[PDB]
Design an enzyme around this catalytic site. Structure first.
Site, mmCIF file in Angstrom:
data_model
loop_
_atom_site.group_PDB
_atom_site.id
_atom_site.type_symbol
_atom_site.label_atom_id
_atom_site.label_comp_id
_atom_site.label_asym_id
_atom_site.label_seq_id
_atom_site.Cartn_x
_atom_site.Cartn_y
_atom_site.Cartn_z
ATOM 1 N N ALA A 1 54.022 50.097 -103.930
ATOM 2 C CA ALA A 1 53.477 50.989 -102.911
ATOM 3 C C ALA A 1 54.363 52.194 -102.611
ATOM 4 O O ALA A 1 54.355 52.714 -101.490
ATOM 5 C CB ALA A 1 53.211 50.214 -101.621
ATOM 6 N N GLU A 2 55.127 52.644 -103.608
ATOM 7 C CA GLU A 2 55.921 53.858 -103.462
ATOM 8 C C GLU A 2 55.017 55.084 -103.463
ATOM 9 O O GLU A 2 55.176 55.998 -102.641
ATOM 10 C CB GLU A 2 56.940 53.934 -104.596
ATOM 11 N N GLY B 1 51.080 43.512 -106.124
ATOM 12 C CA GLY B 1 51.986 42.601 -106.797
ATOM 13 C C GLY B 1 53.406 43.120 -106.844
ATOM 14 O O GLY B 1 54.128 43.056 -105.844
ATOM 15 N N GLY C 1 63.141 53.876 -123.709
ATOM 16 C CA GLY C 1 62.530 52.813 -122.933
ATOM 17 C C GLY C 1 61.727 53.332 -121.750
ATOM 18 O O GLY C 1 61.235 54.465 -121.738
ATOM 19 N N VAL D 1 56.515 45.708 -106.758
ATOM 20 C CA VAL D 1 56.773 46.618 -105.646
ATOM 21 C C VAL D 1 56.269 48.016 -105.992
ATOM 22 O O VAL D 1 57.031 48.899 -106.401
ATOM 23 C CB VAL D 1 58.264 46.601 -105.263
ATOM 24 N N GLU E 1 61.255 51.846 -132.174
ATOM 25 C CA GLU E 1 60.618 52.376 -130.974
ATOM 26 C C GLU E 1 59.111 52.459 -131.161
ATOM 27 O O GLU E 1 58.635 52.954 -132.188
ATOM 28 C CB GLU E 1 61.163 53.761 -130.636
ATOM 29 N N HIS F 1 82.655 56.326 -86.463
ATOM 30 C CA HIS F 1 81.940 56.486 -85.201
ATOM 31 C C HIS F 1 82.018 57.951 -84.794
ATOM 32 O O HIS F 1 83.133 58.496 -84.661
ATOM 33 C CB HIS F 1 82.519 55.591 -84.105
#
Lengths: 461, 461
Positions: free
Chosen positions: B185-186, B181, B37, B183, B31, B445
């Site tokens: 934009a959280e 680049g 990780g 993803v 590590e 429904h």
């Protein structure tokens, strides 16, 4: 004299019956109260609408749980009522012009009995609306109607069910709720989120004793900490005492609150037709006799859900409407290729606090069916969510047959229950196993459905 | 010098690979950043955790639309951060002893690197940690590493990525965010929900130009109104000016805000290992080359996840670890029973406002594959969810091949995108046809998953 080729009463799914195929007949769809049947104006569709207002008004209450502070400020109850039922009043007067203003169909006002068959075998239909007319085939939807115990017919205190309480003029300060079932559990959460103490008075021991056992458990053990849950305590009768309604309880402790509520259960509306004369069995319930193809005992005539199914829901009603609108052409001769309804696995969903959604069989059912079971209960927890909502009590209980791994009914309560049971519904309905779902596909992570992972993974297989 | 039976570089999924089976061998791990990780310490588990706090802080903002009033009152940013990272600080040092001290294994520190093979063909591994040991087989997890453009080495302004910006001591009053680049934009939604103006500065044309075309379109055209979206305009150099940082732009537009962010992308971690000596090719990217069976070019050694795959996600990393933990025993002989990973469809989920979830191929890709398509747009609207919530902007893009009624990738954005694509993911994985999925099963429904209904129904079939 007027006479149509096809007739219909309720238009819950009865408005879906009219299609092409016929396109050149005479059709009547005499609806008694607002076009749409029980579906859009009183039953399924109008519910679950207040639920989002309640869910926002509940997330503000729980905002402290997520390091957030928020104030209720003001409740725009009139704006909520007009947002809910100001949307389905003009649309209700839209499916009616579909079959009144437009040519090859003609609809009239309330009441649609049954009359003695003509000598040539055609079906007679009677409106108490100063008219009588026959036809050749008539399908009956006639929705369903909520049922109030005799405790209300011995007084006359103002009572409300799912039919009207969504359009009550004011928001009560303290509310009474009776009934442990489908129709009654929604309003508890819906109203309590909007700042009213509700007092549950059931007829058995707890809330909704006709669902999953290990789901009733952890729904009781959250409903106790919000609503006043009186167990059995059969309401003997009521007597109004000025303002504030007071019902008399089985143990003498009379209970009081502003507005009332009932809705212990529903009954279909087949009795009002006196079909006894036109040779059709109704059998006490109002259920009206049908079979696989929704075929009764009289010819050309059929029925649909609620009024006839064993599930008083709109999806089963739509499948039965499918077979109804299809079988008037594949004649009753060939019992094959006549198309049958799907009366296997069906989902039920009660949107309360938290939501709940069930499908298939419970542990009691499969144990009474003789199979050895691999039940698991996945906590809305060890997923990467759970801790994101501090969800401590949400669970998804999944039941599966051992040996092969055949899932047989899921029961989920917590945030997002209906949109989480749907993968399990898909697996249930058409020959999917269990492991297939588990490690045959990706689960996005940390997406919400991750619970199913640990629900399926740890099974026998 | 030492030699083990199994070695590992990074334990992102390396703690899950050693999963019984062996149970009685010698294993070494290495590590460099933190045992666990990126999943447990930096990546998947975080980022999406603050998202529910932000989503409550957004539902309060939108409460006014539904006849509800709610106040922003207070943001408990320190309590939110300690609620998030109080879960992954002890558990990181708890699941680490799971795979380090107990009960028959030894792991070391610092960055490790391959060394020249021994004369008997065994793999040598070098930690800058004074000690050196070889082994027989070694798996490389090494996650992925965030990448900052040269734009930061021309200034020295304090920069933040997914690793640290969630643990910034204070919540800024006005924030700048860069990167389009991966993803990323959280954090835009996550922060803007908590009362800070975010300033997006991309490097291409719009936000996240590597997604669906007709979804990038209608996501940019709401992000323009909620967040301050600065288009292209490559920043290059920067100069810090006290608290509020001001970047210098090639076209003059100097942008100002308190805190910074840098999430332009990530890159795999094959270069720093100097594994070039131990005969493994490090392609142009710096990635680690593998194939169907996660088989690299040297024997007994493997790699998984973003460090080697073409998808920088943890679910694909876990599936690759699944095949890896089994393939270290079934030698390269039987390529048919050496079992391969599922590298078809993969789902991605970006948790922003609102959420978005994609799977399979987009319309442009499937057009490049030569099929004539029956695309449908559901609009997320006239269903009972959007009917109760006035949901105007949510969408569901469904792609399917004509003739048979197949499928080529779903793309859903809205309130519930991750837990709704999952039925579509299941339908994708095992040859279910659009027709079958649509009306071959019940859909609750009224309920949210009804969105899928008219998404499948309104098709060629």
């Amino acid at each position: 004299m007027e006479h149509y080729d096809l007739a219909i009463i309720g238009t819950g799914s009865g408005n879906s019956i009219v299609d092409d195929r016929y396109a050149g007949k005479k059709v009547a769809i005499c609806e008694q109260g607002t076009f749409g049947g029980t579906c859009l104006n009183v039953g399924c569709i109008p519910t679950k609408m207040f639920v989002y207002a309640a869910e926002v008004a509940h997330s503000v209450r729980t905002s402290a749980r997520y390091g957030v502070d928020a104030h209720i400020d003001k409740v725009r109850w009139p704006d909520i009522v007009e947002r809910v039922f100001g949307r389905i009043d003009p649309i209700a007067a839209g499916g009616e012009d579909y079959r009144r203003s437009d040519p090859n169909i003609t609809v009239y006002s309330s009441h649609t009995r049954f009359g003695p068959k003509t000598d040539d075998g055609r079906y007679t239909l009677r409106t108490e609306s100063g008219e009588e007319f026959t036809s050749d085939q008539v399908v009956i939807a006639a929705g369903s109607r909520t049922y109030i115990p005799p405790a209300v017919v011995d007084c006359g205190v103002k009572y409300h069910t799912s039919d009207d309480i969504m359009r009550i003029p004011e928001l009560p300060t303290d509310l009474v709720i009776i009934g442990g079932g489908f129709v009654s559990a929604e309003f508890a959460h819906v109203f309590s989120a909007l700042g009213v103490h509700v007092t549950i008075v059931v007829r058995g021991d707890g809330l909704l004793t006709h669902c999953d056992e290990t789901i009733c458990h952890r729904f009781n053990e959250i409903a106790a900490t919000k609503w006043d849950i009186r167990t059995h305590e059969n309401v003997i009768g009521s007597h109004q005492d000025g303002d504030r309604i007071v019902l008399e309880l089985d143990d003498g402790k009379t209970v009081a609150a502003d507005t009332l509520l009932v809705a212990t259960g529903r009954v279909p509306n087949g009795d009002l037709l006196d079909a006894e004369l036109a040779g059709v069995e109704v059998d006490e319930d109002g259920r009206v006799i049908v079979d696989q193809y929704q075929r009764t005992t009289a010819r050309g005539v059929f029925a649909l859900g609620d009024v006839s199914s064993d599930y008083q829901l709109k999806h089963v009603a739509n499948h039965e409407a499918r077979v109804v609108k299809e079988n008037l052409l594949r004649d009753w001769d060939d019992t094959a290729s006549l198309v049958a309804s799907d009366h296997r696995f069906v989902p039920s969903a009660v949107f309360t606090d938290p939501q709940v959604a069930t499908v298939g069989l419970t542990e009691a059912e499969a144990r009474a069916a003789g199979h050895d079971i691999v039940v698991k209960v996945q906590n809305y927890g060890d997923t990467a969510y759970g801790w994101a909502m501090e969800d401590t009590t949400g669970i998804a209980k999944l039941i599966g047959e051992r040996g092969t791994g055949k899932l047989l009914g899921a029961h989920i309560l917590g945030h997002q229950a209906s949109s989480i049971i749907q993968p399990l519904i898909q697996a249930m309905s058409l020959g999917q196993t269990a492991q297939e779902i588990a490690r045959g596909q990706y689960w996005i992570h940390p997406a919400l459905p991750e619970v199913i992972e640990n629900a399926l993974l740890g099974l026998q297989e």
